[PDB]
Amino acid sequence: PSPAVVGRSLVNSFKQFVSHVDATYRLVLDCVAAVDPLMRLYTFGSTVVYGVHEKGSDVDFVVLNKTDVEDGKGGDAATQVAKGLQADILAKLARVIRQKHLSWNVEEVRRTRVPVVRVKGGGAVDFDITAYRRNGVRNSALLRAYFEQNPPCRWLSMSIKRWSKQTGLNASVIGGSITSYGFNLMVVYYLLQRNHLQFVPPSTIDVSRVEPLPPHLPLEEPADEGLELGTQVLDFLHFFLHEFDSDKQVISLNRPGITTKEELDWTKSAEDFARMNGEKVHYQWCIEDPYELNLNVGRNVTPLKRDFLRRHLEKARDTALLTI
Ligand SMILES: O=c1ccn([C@@H]2O[C@H](COP(=O)(O)OP(=O)(O)OP(=O)(O)O)[C@@H](O)[C@H]2O)c(=O)[nH]1
Ligand SMILES: O=c1ccn([C@@H]2O[C@H](COP(=O)(O)O)[C@@H](O)[C@H]2O)c(=O)[nH]1
Ligand SMILES: [Mg+2]
Ligand SMILES: [Mg+2]
Structure with a gap:
């Protein structure tokens, strides 16, 4: 399809969502x-x-x-x-x-x-x-903080999350690898790389100042019948297939710009020594946790689950993330 077509099938797919x-x-x-x-x-x-x-x-x-x-x-x-x-x-x-x-x-x-x-x-x-x-609470406020910058990006997010459960990529589904949280970390990393968001050092998020129950943030419909949502998806998927280099790079909100696996020692060697929950950590798809120490959020992305992820990032380009 095309940004416009994708944009409309998506605004269309969310239409009874817009209806405590x-x-x-x-x-x-x-x-x-x-x-x-x-x-x-x-x-x-x-x-x-x-x-x-x-x-x-x-x-x-x-x-x-x-x-x-x-x-x-x-x-x-x-x-x-x-x-x-x-x-x-x-x-x-x-x-x-x-x-x-x-x-x-x-x-x-x-x-x-x-x-x-x-x-x-x-x-x-x-x-x-x-x-x-x-x-x-720190990473949610950190992601909240970013989404307040550019509030219509929540749609890109929600669109990615729902598709990821639907595809069987989300950690919620059998065979899934990446949590919903991990996906938000990609949406944001992507938007950063593309300049739709301003960098916010994670260490400025101060729990002693977050709200225990923060205020609602009105979500409003895309007022261009989806063209911005549509062109962002097509681009998000292009970013992860053809621009992000999963063999040398790490999705990270810890620094602006590029973070390599080399600098983190998230390498083959590391995998042999590495273990998390009495089990292997993988460094195939690397997503750096803003706050945890040496925690890869895609540690479950086995070399085969990195297949499915590429496989789905391609089908999603022609199915408007499973909507047409
Ligand atoms: O690996 C993880 C997973 C989750 N979390 C923490 O749990 C929070 C929620 O974790 P969820 O992954 O359940 O995401 P969600 O609530 O945004 O969306 P749904 O799939 O529920 O619709 C995350 O936003 C994060 O703060 C982590 O810190 N690390
Ligand atoms: O680092 C984490 C991981 C998990 N959880 C909580 O435990 C649940 C299950 O975690 P997971 O199985 O999605 O990793 C989540 O919904 C969340 O409330 C956290 O607070 N922090
Ligand atoms: Mg959960
Ligand atoms: Mg949740």
């Missing part, structure tokens, strides 16, 4: 007050990034203490004790949520690097609780 989180936030703070009344609740993830709440999206919360919040720029420990601490306080809160809401499924998730409690209410009321981590 405080209540959940409140519901949840109930259970935290019960565990410890001095304990803060922070919202993060797409709600906070986009300033809007989508259907098919959950809500991400983290429970923090006063001093975790005042240490607004501290890192998150990746020690075993940190993980012990976080699991101890999320077991109690889970116990409390179950004990206040019998219909709800409260699953204490332990597969992960980051201990999380997963809650389904049935009423498509969904959410994840984590404890004692700042990086979650």
Whole structure:
């Protein structure tokens, strides 16, 4: 197709999306007050990034203490004790949520690097609780900060996210490699390279100044019937197929300009020594975490999943990201 055609099939595909989180936030703070009344609740993830709440999206919360919040720029420990601490306080809160809401499924998730409690209410009321981590709110505010720069870019984002679940690329789907977060990191990196955004050093995001529940950010329709959205997609996909060099480069918001794998020691050699969650890390598709230490966000992109990613980045160019 063409920028225009793509733009219209996309605005068309979102048209019933354009047709209240405080209540959940409140519901949840109930259970935290019960565990410890001095304990803060922070919202993060797409709600906070986009300033809007989508259907098919959950809500991400983290429970923090006063001093975790005042240490607004501290890192998150990746020690075993940190993980012990976080699991101890999320077991109690889970116990409390179950004990206040019998219909709800409260699953204490332990597969992960980051201990999380997963809650389904049935009423498509969904959410994840984590404890004692700042990086979650820090990177969402960092991505929020950027999206406020150029608010219509949220459409490029939402368009990429939805397609990634649909393609089976998103970490939410079996066989998926990159989280929704990882994809936002690409959207932004791309827009940076192309000058639609101004660089914001990650270290200026100060948790002691973020809002626990930030204000809504009106999402408005593309007022050119999609031409800007359409030409950005066609270009985003061109950027990742023909401009970004996955063998020598790292998608990163840590520096403006290029970051190489060489300078990070994200190399073949590294892979042999590397391990994350009692398992291999891959350095095929490299996405540098703004805040975590030496964490590649596409560590699951096996040499084969890098095939599918290229495979899909090409089909998406002729299917308007699966809409026509
Ligand atoms: O590898 C990860 C994944 C997630 N996160 C933290 O979790 C937040 C939400 O993680 P999600 O990947 O669930 O993304 P999302 O909420 O933007 O979109 P949906 O797929 O839910 O519609 C992210 O924005 C980030 O703060 C990480 O820090 N690292
Ligand atoms: O670095 C991370 C990774 C995960 N999570 C939380 O745990 C859930 C599952 O993580 P993942 O399995 O998508 O990596 C996410 O929705 C999010 O709330 C984080 O806060 N930080
Ligand atoms: Mg989420
Ligand atoms: Mg998630």
